[PDB]
Structure 1
């Protein structure tokens, strides 16, 4: 956990933006009032999180997890008979 104050984060802001993107680790901004505590995350890591939340919210990861552990077998994608549904 990387934790810093609002004051120090603002002074070190440009390096912080570099750091969150090269370490792939969020930085916690924790100040006087937990009201305005925040987290800074690299855009790429945020897009992964956004995409994960979307596939969980639709139930897609639910179905993925079920199919992953089932015994239905596999089929090479080129062997799919599309005209038979």
Structure 2
């Protein structure tokens, strides 16, 4: 569980995107507004997740 506010995430946005691919851990964005609540996944991990749900359904 890595949690950071949107403001703190935007200050180190590029390092965040590298970390989510090198560490393979989702990063949860959460601040004062619930409309910003989101998760950041690496693309390779995201494609692996999409294939697991889709391949075993077929």
Q: How far apart are the structure 1 equivalents of 2:32 and 2:52?
A: 32
Q: How far apart are the structure 2 equivalents of 1:56 and 1:39?
A: 24
Residue aligning to 1:27 = 27
In the superposition, the TM-score normalised over structure 1's length comes to 0.62
Summarize deviations over 1:1-29 as a string: whole Å, max 9, x none.
00000000001101001100100001000
Report which of the two structures shows the higher radius of gyration computed on alpha carbons. 1
Summarize deviations over 1:2-58 as a string: whole Å, max 9, x none.
00000000011010011001000010000112222111111000001111121344x
Please, which runs of 5 or more residues in structure 1 have no aligned partner?
58-85
Give the match's secondary structure for 1:25: coil
Please, which runs of 5 or more residues in structure 2 have no aligned partner?
none
In the superposition, the TM-score normalised over structure 2's length comes to 0.88
Residue aligning to 2:2 = 2
